[model samples]
Target: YSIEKLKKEENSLAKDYYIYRLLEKNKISKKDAQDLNSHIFRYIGKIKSELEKIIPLKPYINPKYAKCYTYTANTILDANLTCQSVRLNSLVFIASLNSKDRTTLAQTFKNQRPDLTNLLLAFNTSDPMSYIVQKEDINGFFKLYNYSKKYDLDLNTSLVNKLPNHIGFKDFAQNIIIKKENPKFRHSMLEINPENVSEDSAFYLGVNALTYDKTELAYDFFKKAAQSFKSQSNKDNAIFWMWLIKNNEEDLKTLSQSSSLNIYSLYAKELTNTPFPKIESLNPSKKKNNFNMQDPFAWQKINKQIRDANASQLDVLAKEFDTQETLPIYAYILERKNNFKKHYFIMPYYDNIKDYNKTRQALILAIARQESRFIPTAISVSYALGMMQFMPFLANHIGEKELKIPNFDQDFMFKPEIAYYFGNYHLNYLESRLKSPLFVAYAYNGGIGFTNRMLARNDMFKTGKFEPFLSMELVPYQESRIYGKKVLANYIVYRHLLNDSIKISDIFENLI
Candidate 1:
């Protein structure tokens, strides 16, 4: 709609966008008499004023931009509450805001943008309390290092190393963790028991106790979260964790039949020996799938076409990508059409991958499945590229140094063979240091530094009540936390399909 049309329908960010665009063309002065009374005018004024100091501004980091960013907190958020208008020069202005505004704004970012919550934490003025010990102050941990780098502030080398920091709720720690070893945890109750806790947090509290083998307390916590949680039988990991902690066979059996696959549901099926469900396959079409699978631009075009496809047209669309190499795209169409409960997984590049060892092949499949669903041109909102989601700089470094390719462009990431080569090289480095596939997945998705700090922790990945599984659940970054489980599950599935099965329990059994 035109700006005039939009104004009649509803006043919103779009209407302001038009006004701002006009002002930008006119060298930044506004004469909107009605908007002079609104907060959005001042916000636009804030952006206009920053143009005076505009040496350079990073352009249009829109929600749709593909790149899996590895930035620490304080870069910005979903709506990007940057007073500096997302300019590199304006980072200095962040330090100008009061702590409350900064924190509240960050918290707002945290809640509204669940997908990008790892982008930042609430601005923690508290000293780095207890490093990885108090995960809450982990806000200051990596936040101090790279977050400072964003602002061109002093780089604290000591703070830089603490990468696996978690910003857990402080109330959860004080009430549950410190009082963990008491007889109350064994038989009685927490005099410091958390009251009015939410379902998600309560479920986590149960997991914390389960690590220590305090079954009764864990059971108590689990039951609370389970009853409080509201969702369908197929959904909600909170209830699954609850049921597992309490040894509720009936509930687990029900969850085992779930059509959707997640870490919790996969575990339930594993314990019950319930088979994973499969979706019906699409029939082939004679039409050529002309969209270049190896081109990032082409992938975006395909993404948009499939995104805009109707339910009935999806079958025809899916048939177009039904070739041997394009199964990933075909399956993605199935997923969107039949709701997300439907998925198709396969070793698409087997002809090329057959030469590799089975384990390597399976692991590569696992990573590619989660990273980009085997889409060679896949790119994330944070700028991570290719099937394996390598950051551009690392991709360049590896191409030039390891692969001995003198000339490199980041677009080389779109080629399937090249993406696989870099992935193998990077995975080799990660596996050399951390042995477990699960931990390796963590390091792969998160950084090696993040995994290092996580493993270095006194209680993590060590022998305990639940040992590695519990530790794996507590990872600080939600993306890495979920990614680790997803990749591991995929790894196991691919291994099984390749005729080299590894039991999920055995995976955790080998952990230190």
Candidate 2:
């Protein structure tokens, strides 16, 4: 009887029926259960039809195969249609089939539709490699790398070597080194010449060199990277590391003079004990607002165009806004459009949140930009949601314990105002517990416990004193290490925007 009960209740449909049965037994309205069942049936019908077409195809037909497979699977998962057992089973069967009949289907999906290929990889219980081409495509290598981690599959050097030069080789090598700790692999990574790789790869090599205590080698790599880096941010980072290793006043002064509002710039100013440059006494431009503000629909029309415009089109649109006041609106539009240059408009929201110190506000904005690009509705794969990407559990804890709001739902996180309110609160709380922005960022991203352990155990922090740059190099989690660097960079940028005259050294007064 127990086995029968378990068997009858095993499938998703059984779970739904259980809900219906419970509701009916509790004397709730029968209509509610009927309505739920009706929706379930309609969804099931759609999935069945979607899967039916793909199941019969031998060497399946053109583009339709990829499109139908993805659309059906996504719809089923999104609607939680696991209750439709037969149809779900059918879908899985199609995904799992290794028949020569589906060869054309797999090849077509791989070449023409990577999106569909990725979907299949997610559901396919069989050998995912059969559906992948590891060498020819970077996406394939990335997919294989991800699959290897997810399924505990082995990755040979031959497969890793297939990764192209410009495709984040340092990260690939670092991850492999972290996972396996192979000296040969580490040596191979070190052998990569700076001239032969991208500036980013060179930077990562320097990071790896530092990890191995090859300080002289790391300094050489960083110094070379700084001279050749295309982006000023990259240059600033390399210079900062060089300053950290040698305590070069000239290097510090050069980094401090950088216009980039980034962590290194701030750090450079701090090391040199310099003040931020004063804001020039230039008055506001008297130029008329170029855009038609009189029309009620102007913003709506502009937003629509922005949403529809591609990157190139958006660049053209950006140049049209010349006035200072209109620039903020342009920045807002750019932010919504996910443009990389949205850093310009980030200051507006900072002004809205009250009671935050300048450093705290700058850091919070930096974290937000990195977390969600200021997108209010953003959600991570782990279900961390909103502008700050707060995990639901953390949000609930903060809500009940700190803000005294007893009930909080994850759905409410999508609202920009609420997300920022909670995000700022979380940042301020972390700052209170940790005096240094670098440590606060590390704690914020990784966890206070993990950060403390890292500080206590890592040789870099043994003196009960902190060297911000060196400590960052020792941060155990690569994600947190990078997150701390990015947030610090973002913070300095914000500080620069807020007060041009505020020296980078001024911001680090508490830390130093």
Candidate 3:
């Protein structure tokens, strides 16, 4: 294939496969082939390692693609880079730079921000290159605040305050509250002058107030914090706590609809006995097409076309995928054109899953629904493959070690039946350790160790005022936190569909 043709292959592995194929054939120059591969070096790690034997693929050190070159490039040429831009590159660069060097590099920050990424990485190097404590990075501080340098505690307090005032920093804020055992620092945190403080800071201060029995101040803070958060999640977070403290039914009703379907909204739904946003049956148009669901390239082409298309464009475009195999696309388009919430639950492979017991079936459907929306050929940006979204390492382990399916191509994962077979094997493993579907969902999304550490925490999932609901709200990892909740919601929905009784509160109340 031509360079342009290879570049547009969409699937990174497939594109690399074709690129390697060209390299073997001498159809493309070694430099071009290696550089092309470098564009996705992390995903194609094993392939790049082998290619180095034939022709040494020198590291392509571009700061712009630092993350892409993580496993390939050793050194970051850039002296100063934010954690968001230079994630693992900072970690890899740590060995080369001494403490003095990191300090010097960090000194470039005019605000004197801590080197949170490097500090986090040095603390846990084998740590899966997860997200920084950004956004709803609840666990960001989970990795940070535990290391008590009573000496550094004083320093970190100021550093924590200096960092952007965000909800994720709640852990650090409370760490001080716990360690300092002083109300003065707490007051500094809580009273950052209600003026010019962020909505996140306001909410954090609200929590600080509530922690100290300052109910009226907490209420004011929650109300003020709830005023103008762009993220409905944050806004609804404030509103939820606001109501739990005290409120009107109208507030509950508003919180019920306004949240982005979090623990808050779920609670409101149960309290109000409101039915979940509907999931209707979607039928593909009677028109026919020769789309092959198993072919990643074919689906990739279709995906690109619809990615940014308008509703009218989708109306015209969705017809091209009108078949049983392409039902996911049809449902997606239907939801997009009409705006979801009135969505469709298209289970494309009931035959393969019907034999499992009801609970097992519900769990499988719940995970798949959240993981890929039943897209058999789906691939995440991090290279998690297919319906179950298995990373290559785990897929290889299950394929070779457990299933005895030697020499199986990862593409086999695109087949729905095989995906379910392998997915269930892993799900069964998670189920063995975690009985709670929510915790199982967490283990499924964020590995068992993470879930274990989360559950082990004193402040979470225990008998307290809010107890589990409060704990659920504070789960640090955004993807797993949201993933577990959505999967549980989907699980609850699926259970009712399968004629089993389940409730969100009952599930939490019974969680071990």
Candidate 4:
């Protein structure tokens, strides 16, 4: 039970479980958890020390110990760990256990710890069909696809039909199911001609067409959607698409006059070869005899209350403190509590990093601006945390292997300094591997493996010199595609702020 004993334990899982037991049993206070957690660092250091004991690091060196170390680190900080990592770690541990023992443990944990049980069932080498059948819900359908792809299992019609009819999920289901039925069924079943779709549906179909390289179809759909859509946002997007497809003067003029301050409007100005719009400086007139001067912590107290307030209560507080200084705080509360308008408060962390090149530092700042808007406590639905939104698995891997900081935990991710350090470090690593800053942006948001896969499949990316605009249009993942564009625009703005001479076209040229 002692930290010293836990540090020296040879079995990584036992050590992790021992710590988990302590926390679960309320045997440790918050301070005690922090103190005992220091053992993880000591344990990682010992593993590295052992590796260094060998004459030279080589691929021939079996990865058994390395895998164990990673699994233990992941398990100790399970909240941040991805399900895939858990499955892999569980499989590794199950391999070491005898038949009866493994069976008993799996069955016992099934009801007590469903997450662990799911991992065990999903990754089990023998008889995975049992778990496959049990996975019929929407989340399980996604997991089923993953398991099938990873294990090369043949898809069954019944299981395929189990997928939800959600837009993205429906597209995925159609693609996978149809493709499985006939290899020649390459075209997506989700496609609809512009005439058959409504204004909103037409815009979405246009996007889908663009994604699949149906350029003429996309152009037609976008043109139709632009003129007919009632929603200003949808109309703006359609016009932006038309501008992208064939940079016509009219479309550019249309986008330029749009009221939206989003990336589309910003890029429209750049595309027209016009000067970027000057950002109006906010000079809030200080009212005479404002009550805040009497009590220094007045704003601080309001901020604290804002943090604790519900959505309805926060709306009232936001209206009460409607100054430039306090508005960003209200926006931060909105982002963290309601998951809306995430780009607020981004300027505060612009200059947080030091010792990196200005452009690279600016790019990192841009990413943070897009990722969490300088909110150190931001947590994504996918469990990515902190200002840079580092996922648990990536954080653990980078901490152990790259940064040589063995015991970095998710708790530390909520700290601004530590989050920026790791975020920038990861960005630097990606830049080294992928020369194109755009590709680095893609790899930062989507994984490098997925980025590489997308590149490998698309011949347009094979050559080094492709149009940057077209290249982004081909980015497969919807989230990463939008993310790359926003980050690129943010980077341009940050660079311009740093040095006015920098142009958006210059950044695009480099991207090309």
Candidate 5:
């Protein structure tokens, strides 16, 4: 019977086999499926073999679908194996497939390794070599390189010539040495000389380490890269590292000393010199000519007044603020003030600020106005509470729940100083993913995952010419669409106020 016809038949096993055949169509032939399903016990072997094929394919396919098949195959294999009816050879094959190139292949293993050194060395050997490797497979390719060096595996020139387009490859090429008898894995690439290395790439690598919790490694990389990194881009990256290491006084001081001319260092110095600029003073003329704020900017006035009223004395709002029991309010203020020097105030907080310090204050004030208008008692119907309008789930995640934080108390948010700390951290998270304030803002309001999927679709639409946030177009959700626009607008205003020479319109057209 045809596959579709078998699927619709009444027998459940037949239907399952039919569906299984469809899933297996790409890798295994039709004749193999027929022979495999000839008997019930033999059908078990088919499942085992299928599992082997699926394991390698998992990293290459959509993870969710791959996982579903993996679970199903594992279930059938468990049943057969426990019955002791499965063949030994088939089981061995299954084991090898599962363990092949397994870098602790969790269900989430996303890519293969890069074999740069191997590829390079292979180029010099008389042996036939693999060619035209997939860029996505570079992860596995890298392991081969590591193994070749660590184990003194044979290397040929052909392999070296096949260096994939990656900084890590360039790094290996510049630094890799063939030692006599035994050599050691030296300090990480961070400790290597910076000549011929791009600061931005080094910073990029450091940022990745930081995300993965290799703080010391990240610091070392940033410390080295920050010294002579001339790009505004590289300076921004170094500042980001400093922010991560801000609580580390010695490291922060070292960073400060190294890059006094760095934008962030200058801002840090400026903060010590300049008190928070009055919001009204920043935009004294307060011209609202260009952007249509009625839809979004209208929020500014209402939120500002509410935030202003809540700025002092947490006692009026709740017992949490009254007791000085929770995180101090000034902590939030100081953090926000600190971020302003780094331009952390605007949506996609990292991207919008020309003067990072002012951006920091503007962001604190914006969050204050947006979340609770600094109202110690503000509440939103969406169940957001506090000055930051944190969701209960988020509040709980951050341990705000134990502070006797109300289910929907805006007053708790009035601890702007405390909220700023969390807000700035969260902003950094979004910026890393979406890499743009617009989509990051969208992610903040909607879900980051959802925004990511939408961006993926938008990315496909542009055929990869336009970037995620920069090319965001015709987004369906009204709230998210407006949220992104408003955040960008607010960021522009913040940047403009910091440097009067910059116009609001200039931010939209020129800054990006």
Candidate 6:
């Protein structure tokens, strides 16, 4: 068969095998399998480009096509690409880099040459190299250098520092150089030990201590390596150490007592200006249960105190909601008595609009509370940023496409109003599209596709008729499932409180 035919055959076989496997397990439908297969192929094309840039292999990646692949891969990496896709892309990167760099060498070096497996083993070992060095195998780095040499591109030290960062090697690079070892390594180990750790070994050692969680030990090492730790990253370490151990304060106190320690002591004092937070003022209260906000009794005590306070204070509280026209929302707030009363302060703005027919403030508050615990800086492991935990694409679509809001930067998610508006808009969109707030909540946690699939499954269970969110089984994903329930519960509580007819448990009962 021709090369193109063989490639097509291989693709077909792989796609068929994956579909068959999924069908056997009853994990997904034929349509899902086909969609996934298409995504995989598209993703592979994107991965191929990034691999060429980092790997520096000469095998299949031509110079003309290299730029396209590199640009595409970088874009995929930056976007909300799945971890599996990223990992596969990274593997391809290593493979390409290895193939090109490790050509036939002299007999002496060839015999000593560490192949991909050994290099990968060394790379995988819990050491600093993993962070600093992207190319786990010597072949990977060799290929990069080979590509650079072949292209006559200048591979300077600055460029070298960037390699680890690109490959998620920041922490690994920091760790490798600081460990007490010989400065030089065999060429075989060059890829594994990319960062030349010899120059500022002391500074690295301090950083390593921090990495190893020897926080206190790091303080001393950081103090000694102050000169070496000049960069912003390193300076942050120095500040951290001085904060932990009262080094600068003690030194200054000693100097003030003595007359002999003069110019050098003064310089030390100047350099040792590490401002620490007032520890005494930050004393933890004995009565504070910092972790558990779910205790009903504790919440009641807190709520009653606030509620039974002077009429003036209660009137002031009433005025804020009244001013915002948030009384309807506030009514729901009073219904959530079983849960923590912190909700009262947090969700004071909960109110039904007379005209817009938007969701009650209580329902919105419930969604926000469940989504982020009202923490504005909340970030998910998937890099969903800010209070709404919005993915970049979703944020852009909501802000730019739907709302036509100009200058909507995803990085500026910290801006509360912007995040709130976009978050609420997205929630509204999801609610409208799914026609079930529960499904919308699930979509909020998982994606819309997953939520729709769950809705379909629920429809099948109900005599081929799509049931409301209450009748559907919970979507099993930990985040999506719990978030949906919590939001619904909060909504019910709010609805009951506002209307003063339905109970919180009554709403939950309707779910079954």
Q: Which parts of model 6 have CA positions greater than 4 angstroms off? A: 1-345, 348-358, 458-474, 496-512
Tens digit of per-residue lDDT, candidate 4, span 410-453: 55676767777887888878888877666788999998998777
RMSD of each: 14.1, 13.3, 9.3, 14.0, 21.5, 23.2
The full ranking of all candidates by TM-score, starting with the best, is 3, 1, 4, 2, 6, 5
What TM-score does candidate 4 get on C-alpha atoms?
0.54
lDDT of 3 by residue, 5-85 (tens): 767556554465545545555676655655564544244454565566556756667766565444322343342364423
Clashes of 2: 9
> Between prediction 2 and prediction 5, which has the larger lDDT?
2
Candidate 1 ranges with C-alpha deviation above 4 Å: 1-199, 208-217, 220-236, 276-287
lDDT measured at residue 58 in model 2 versus the true structure, 0 to 100: 56
Give the residue spans of candidate 2 off by over 4 A: 1-168, 176-180, 187-192, 211-213, 227-230, 243-259, 269-329, 334-346, 349-352, 356-366, 372-383, 400-408, 415-417, 463-466, 490-512
Off by over 4 Å in 3: 1-34, 37-187, 193-225, 231-237, 257-263, 285-288
User: What TM-score, computed on C-alpha atoms, does each candidate reach?
Assistant: 0.62, 0.53, 0.69, 0.54, 0.29, 0.32
The most accurate candidate by lDDT is: 3
TM-score computed on alpha carbons, candidate 5: 0.29
Residue pairs with backbone atoms closer than 3 Å in model 4 (clashes)? none
lDDT of 2 by residue, 294-364 (tens): 22234435655777888778777766653454544455555545533323525434445546666666777
Clash count list over all predictions? 11, 9, 2, 0, 51, 12
Q: Poorest 10 consecutive residues of model 2 by lDDT?
A: 79-88
What does candidate 6's lDDT look like per residue over 238-284, in tens digits?
Answer: 44344434556664444323222122222233345522111111111
What digit string (tens of lDDT, one per residue) describes model 5 on residues 1-512?
A: 45444434443332344345455556445553453343222234445566446433234655533433343323433433222122211222223333322222222222321242233333333321233122323443454445444432333333333432454664453334211121222223333333334465455445434434566766665665676577543554465465555456554444344322333343343334432323321111222233221221223332343245543532232222222222222233332334323322322222323334665545544444445534343345443554566665665565554445446332233344445655666776776776645555677778798776765662222433122222332354556655555555455445555563233333333213
